[PDB]
Nucleic acid binder design. Structure first.
Ligand code: NA
Ligand code: NA
Length: 324
DNA sequence: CCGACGCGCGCATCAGC
DNA sequence: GCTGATGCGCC
DNA sequence: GTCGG
């Protein structure tokens, strides 16, 4: 809570910019500000003190002065009591309702969850499933539930084909106390960049046979997005439903994907800006050499995560320590 | 001053032909 | 019927 | 909104 009142404000402003204003660069500007402020180790006492930080400019500085002198933000107080704006903001908390659907709904008088319940006919399939599990989807997932979840995912995936490789990435892979969802990266030997896609459906189908996956938000041939729920012990309170994603990557790109999706995020930007001060370009799929021109060669065979630690030649930095 | 800002990705849905 | 654009939720 | 060419 050193600067919590300031970051809460910047994050509040950010959400309104994303959801009501539909100004995504302001959203990220506000969130960037909140990030550098949350990590600044002093109780900020002035907008001017703040403006020294990268991502804090004049306007956010002035907003801090008003916050620090009066407790509040006039613009925020006003927006907060504003029925149209705050309804739009709120409906975006329904998964499948982004800022356009929420603008559309608040135009036609749908402002609340109940209003959606009375107009299910006007929600696509994703939105219905977001509305149904609205509460569950806002709970975090404790690491201990992630382990049981990961037990089921790996058990069943090896059950369909012992040659599948599955990895749970996300902050969970780095050891997090809790997770917001489960991101599962899938691969098979029979799936290369130069390849046949039957493999995702087989795994989704097995996880629905054991009633682990309960609903389907979107499915294709390389990405699945849906809902899962741990089995209850018959007598106990039933676990909340959880968001789950499963990505079928090719094998020659898999460990690039594992690294990318594991992260953490800013770990990778260091990992990448400081990747090419060495001569091997990196993204999410491949590591490719460059030349004095700057055009890429052809990517060299990463078949374990740690050949991105040979090609750029860092030592071992495991899931654990990739905080940045 | 004025554009960049994830030099972003898979899938579901809509606008349009 | 199709393509391309736009909406969406994410590491 | 903040940065930088
Ligand atoms: Na600054
Ligand atoms: Na939403």
């Amino acid at each position: 809570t050193l600067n919590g009142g300031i970051t809460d404000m910047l994050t509040e402003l950010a959400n309104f910019e994303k959801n009501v204003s539909q100004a995504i660069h302001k959203y990220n500007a506000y969130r960037k500000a909140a990030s550098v402020i949350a990590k600044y180790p002093h109780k900020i006492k002035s907008g001017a003190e703040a403006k020294k930080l990268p991502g804090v400019g004049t306007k956010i500085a002035e907003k801090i002065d008003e916050f620090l002198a009066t407790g509040k933000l006039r613009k925020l107080e006003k927006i907060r009591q504003d029925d149209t704006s705050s309804s739009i903001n709120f409906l975006t908390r329904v998964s499948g309702i982004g800022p356009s659907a929420a603008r559309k709904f608040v135009d036609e008088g749908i402002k609340t969850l109940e209003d959606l319940r009375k107009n299910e006919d006007k929600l696509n399939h994703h939105q219905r499933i977001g509305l149904k599990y609205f509460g569950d989807f806002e709970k975090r997932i404790p690491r201990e539930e992630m382990l049981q979840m990961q037990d089921i995912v790996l058990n069943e995936v090896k059950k369909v084909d012992s040659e599948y490789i599955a990895t749970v990435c996300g902050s969970f892979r780095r050891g997090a106390e809790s997770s917001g969802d489960m991101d599962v990266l899938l691969t098979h030997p029979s799936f290369t960049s130069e390849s046949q896609p039957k493999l995702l459906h087989q795994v989704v189908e097995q996880l629905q046979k054991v009633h682990f996956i309960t609903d389907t938000l979107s499915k294709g041939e390389t990405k699945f997005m849906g809902v899962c729920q741990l089995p209850s012990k018959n007598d106990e309170k039933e676990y909340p439903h959880r968001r789950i994603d499963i990505r079928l990557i090719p094998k020659d790109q898999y460990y690039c994907g594992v690294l990318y999706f594991t992260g953490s995020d800013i770990f990778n930007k260091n990992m990448r800006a400081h990747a090419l001060e060495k001569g091997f370009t990196i993204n999410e799929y491949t590591i490719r050499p460059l030349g004095v021109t700057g055009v890429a060669g052809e990517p060299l065979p990463v078949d374990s995560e740690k050949d991105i630690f040979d090609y750029i030649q860092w030592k071992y930095r495991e899931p654990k320590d990739r905080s940045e």
